[PDB]
Design a binder for this molecule. Structure first.
Ligand SMILES: NC(=O)[C@@H](Nc1ccc2c(c1)OCCn1cc(N3C(=O)OC[C@H]3C(F)(F)F)nc1-2)C1CC1
Length: 898
């Protein structure tokens, strides 16, 4: 109990709320989550102590590897006859004298071969499984037998033409530094009739009693609008109450819905709102699951605390809004009464559903020609023609925002068994289902049950707000379990954490998958913790994420202690920036910096801000602060530029100073998503042998409009260049930074990076570019900063990155008529190739954005905001028509040239 009390305080500090607040929650679902989720905690700990110390080392330092060992042609061609020059460092003499041994080995060498070759070279100057390779400068290790080139550091070194520097370290020097953490089960581990839904022979009705806390400006006549939803799909007509004055919100009225109680799908929800009156307007909204976590249909009296309308939603109901009561009890509260059946009504078991499904398939197989003719949703087996099979393949290639007509819905459903042969059609088939028909849904269940597995990126769509059904989401998660690699889990983690908000219940298959992975991979565990923590201010998800964080913190081990260092450092930084903006905002930079340095140097603050792991990359150790290098930036929201020593023995070989931008006041979530997408686009380009180097720098939101930005070394804004002006000033600067034989490499890098950002910003519809948000590296690498805006952030498509004379001059190597040059023609060709490459992967990009609708991002609120990408990628047009469209967008913007 003394250890439990201390641990509870550590978790309380990490989550930012006391654990006891959970213990007080009366809700049985909350207490069942807390207890039942501990098996995932147990399993994860069991896997970590399966092959100790190695399995523990693998958890803390997982291999940072690529998804595939195969190297793209242009990347393999960068190697000398398939071989790589590698530097291996050995610390041998006292006072840590560093010895280097240059090796030329095959790119696909296992670390054990790399170590033996180093020992051979060390011996040539005068066991193999008693050492490990570590990346010089950071806590990155090569613990698993992967081809060398598969580790991201090595692949990055080949792609950039940099020398890989690895340090030989004794296994026991790492192992002894890994503490044993025994996971202890918490105190809380130790805890009429019943009829099936398909037996209740009655129509659906819900009684609306009255409303409390309806404080409005005497707004006049008010009513409650209700609807039965399955995701966003209405299951019946919307039913409103009689109009009443806001001075007395009383209805005591039964609302009858056009839906049979046995027809109710598992994910059925009641969507309601208090509206005012004809200019109708919602005032407060709220959603309810018609079945609880135990599969029980709602019965009796219930009070629902409503939510405020979001600036932009003109619609009277909010089905894609959060489901459940408002944690704030000083809000419009609507009392509702549910139907009584003199027994507990439960959703039928899978065996009842399977029996009913097989009864229907059998009944349908016996249907005569004329019977099949009564419904377009009923087709015959032998009547399936090749043209129909062709139409099916065509429908399957359409994007997730392509409208499926009622005719195609009936078509896909009648050919559902053929659909199994083309399994990627599953999301379209699911939207074709009559979710308000138990016969159809029961049959869909059995098809999902045995559905062929699909690509993890295709399965992710099935986890968004369009697919609420648990059988469907279970299938999506099973595909992620079988085919999602840790690399790709890390890449899409923000979306996967987002879609948790769409789960009906706290205890679900997705959360179990995500938690097991977070507790079996510390690299995943780290970002899992921060994505959840950053949203703990948001009362729409703070209970779910709080309980999720509590389970993670109980089983993560020693990393909780390290996370508490990062949390405390972030809090001290939030504290300082908050004082500067409320108590020192009007003072001079000199005065503000004087205050900063004095507050930072306080021993309590000084220690909290030194000797912790970078939340941007936990493999990066933040040593002592370099205060002389710390400063308040002139930028909006006055961000802090912070510098730390890299305590790593071989810091000089990576970077001797870790520079991070701490910014308080701006929502860094859109930037995080844009940067994530930029990286995905780059990966797509590289795989197709199209070397357009992007700079997706690190960015992490750590709270409500608080975050970290990775500083890019040796970079300057376009304005910073020209301020030392002619159009030749930038090209003059580049020529000055890359004199002689290396000048062409810089022009090539600029052109390539420039083509990437032209295409990326045009597709995504990023905020207008200017000399202060376009940056350039000494070597010529062009990149964009400040991704605060994207998509339709105006009210018809924009070109955010318009190439001025400055950019065209660099591309054309200093020519006057830069538009009419071969260099510019090769530049245009890179844009065309890049644009069409992304167009080919549009479903992915649409899916990545759709999974982000749950998030409170102001530019990504509806599917129509995502529609912007359908327009920029010209998906309704042909490929040549799309190329023609892009050229017109470029030609109009640049007033010619394209
Ligand atoms: N050139 C410079 O002034 C300095 N180097 C620099 C500055 C800013 C960023 C950067 C590098 O790395 C790229 C990432 N980055 C991103 C941002 N920002 C951004 O995305 O929004 C505004 C701005 C800020 F102020 F928030 F950092 N700034 C930088 C150099 C003198 C030391």
């Amino acid at each position: 109990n003394r250890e439990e009390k201390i641990l509870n305080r550590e978790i309380g500090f990490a989550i930012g709320m006391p654990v006891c607040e959970f213990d007080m929650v009366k809700d049985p679902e909350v207490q069942d989550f807390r207890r039942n989720i501990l098996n995932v905690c147990k399993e994860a700990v069991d896997l970590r102590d399966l092959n100790s110390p190695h399995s523990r080392a693998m958890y803390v330092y997982p291999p940072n590897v690529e998804s595939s060992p195969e190297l793209p042609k242009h990347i393999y061609n960068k190697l000398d006859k398939g071989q790589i020059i590698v530097v291996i460092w050995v610390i041998v003499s006292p006072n840590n004298d560093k010895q280097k041994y240059t090796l030329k080995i095959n790119h696909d060498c296992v670390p054990e071969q790399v170590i033996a070759e180093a020992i051979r070279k060390k011996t040539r100057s005068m066991y193999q499984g008693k050492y490990i390779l570590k990346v010089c400068g950071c806590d990155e290790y090569f613990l698993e037998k992967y081809p060398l080139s598969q580790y991201k550091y090595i692949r990055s070194c080949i792609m950039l033409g940099r020398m890989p520097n690895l340090m030989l370290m004794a296994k026991e020097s790492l192992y002894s530094q890994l503490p044993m953490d025994c996971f202890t089960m918490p105190s809380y581990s130790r805890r009429t009739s019943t009829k099936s839904l398909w037996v209740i022979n009655s129509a659906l009705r819900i009684k609306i009693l009255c409303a409390t806390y309806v404080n409005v400006n005497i707004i006049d006549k008010i009513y409650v609008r209700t609807g039965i939803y399955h995701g966003g799909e209405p299951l019946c007509d919307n039913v409103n109450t009689q109009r009443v004055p806001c001075s007395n919100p009383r209805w005591n009225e039964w609302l009858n819905y056009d839906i049979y109680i046995p027809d109710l799908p598992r994910a059925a929800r009641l969507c309601l709102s208090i509206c005012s009156v004809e200019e109708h307007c919602p005032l407060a909204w709220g959603n309810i699951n018609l079945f609880d976590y135990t599969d029980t249909l709602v019965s009796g009296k219930m009070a629902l605390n409503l939510w405020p309308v979001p600036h932009g939603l003109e619609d009277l109901l909010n089905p894609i809004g959060v489901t459940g009561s408002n944690p704030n009890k000083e809000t419009p509260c609507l009392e509702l009464e549910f139907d009584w059946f003199s027994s507990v009504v439960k959703f039928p078991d899978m065996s009842v559903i399977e029996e009913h499904a097989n009864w229907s398939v059998s009944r349908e197989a016996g249907f005569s020609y004329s019977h099949a003719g009564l419904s377009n949703r009923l087709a015959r087996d032998n009547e399936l023609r090749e043209n129909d099979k062709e139409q099916l393949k065509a429908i399957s290639t359409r994007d997730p925002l392509s409208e499926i007509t009622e005719q195609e819905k009936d078509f896909l459903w009648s050919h559902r068994h053929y659909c199994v042969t083309i399994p990627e059609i599953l999301p379209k088939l699911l939207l074709s289902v009559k979710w308000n028909s138990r016969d159809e849904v029961a049959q869909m269940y059995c098809l999902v049950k045995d559905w062929p597995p699909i690509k993890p990126e295709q399965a992710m769509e099935l986890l968004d707000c369009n697919y609420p059904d648990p059988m469907v989401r279970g299938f999506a998660v099973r595909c992620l379990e079988k085919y999602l690699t840790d690399d790709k889990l890390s890449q899409y983690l923000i979306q996967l954490v987002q879609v948790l908000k769409y789960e009906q219940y706290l205890d679900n298959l997705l959360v179990r998958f995500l938690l097991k992975k977070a507790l079996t991979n510390q690299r995943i565990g780290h970002f899992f913790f921060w994505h959840l923590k950053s949203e703990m201010h948001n009362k729409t998800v703070s209970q779910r994420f709080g309980l999720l964080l509590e389970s993670y913190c109980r089983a993560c081990g020693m990393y909780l202690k390290h996370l508490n260092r990062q949390v405390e450092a972030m809090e001290k930084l939030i504290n300082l920036t908050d004082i500067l903006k409320q108590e020192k905002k009007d003072e001079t930079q000199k005065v503000q910096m004087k205050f900063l340095v004095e507050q930072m140097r306080r021993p309590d603050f000084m220690d909290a801000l030194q000797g912790f792991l970078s939340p941007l990359n936990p493999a990066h150790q933040l040593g002592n602060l370099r205060l002389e290098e710390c400063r308040i930036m002139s930028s909006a929201k006055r961000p802090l530029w912070l510098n730390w020593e890299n305590p790593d023995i071989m810091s000089e070989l990576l970077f001797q100073n870790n520079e991070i931008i701490f910014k308080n006041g701006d929502d860094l979530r859109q930037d995080m998503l844009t940067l994530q997408i930029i990286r995905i686009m780059e990966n797509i380009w590289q795989n197709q042998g199209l070397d357009l180097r992007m700079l997706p720098y690190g960015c992490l939101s750590i709270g409500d409009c608080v975050g970290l930005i990775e500083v890019v070394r040796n970079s300057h804004t376009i304005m910073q260049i020209q301020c030392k002006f002619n159009s030749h000033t930038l090209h003059q600067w580049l020529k000055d930074k890359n004199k002689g034989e290396i000048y062409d490499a810089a022009i090539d890098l600029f052109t390539r990076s420039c083509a990437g950002y032209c295409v990326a910003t045009f597709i995504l519809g990023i905020g207008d570019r200017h000399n202060s948000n376009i940056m350039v590296k000494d070597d010529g690498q062009l990149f964009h900063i400040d991704f605060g805006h994207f998509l339709d952030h105006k009210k018809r498509e924009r070109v955010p990155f318009v190439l001025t004379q400055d950019f065209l001059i660099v591309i054309s190597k200093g020519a006057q008529e830069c538009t009419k040059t071969r260099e510019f023609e090769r530049f245009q060709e890179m844009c065309y190739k890049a644009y069409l490459a992304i167009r080919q992967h549009a479903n992915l990009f649409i899916n990545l954005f759709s999974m982000m609708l749950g998030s409170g991002m102001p530019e990504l609120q509806s599917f129509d905001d995502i529609a912007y990408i359908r327009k920029t990628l010209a998906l309704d047009k042909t490929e040549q028509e799309a190329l023609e469209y892009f050229m017109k967008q470029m030609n109009d913007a640049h007033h010619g040239g394209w």
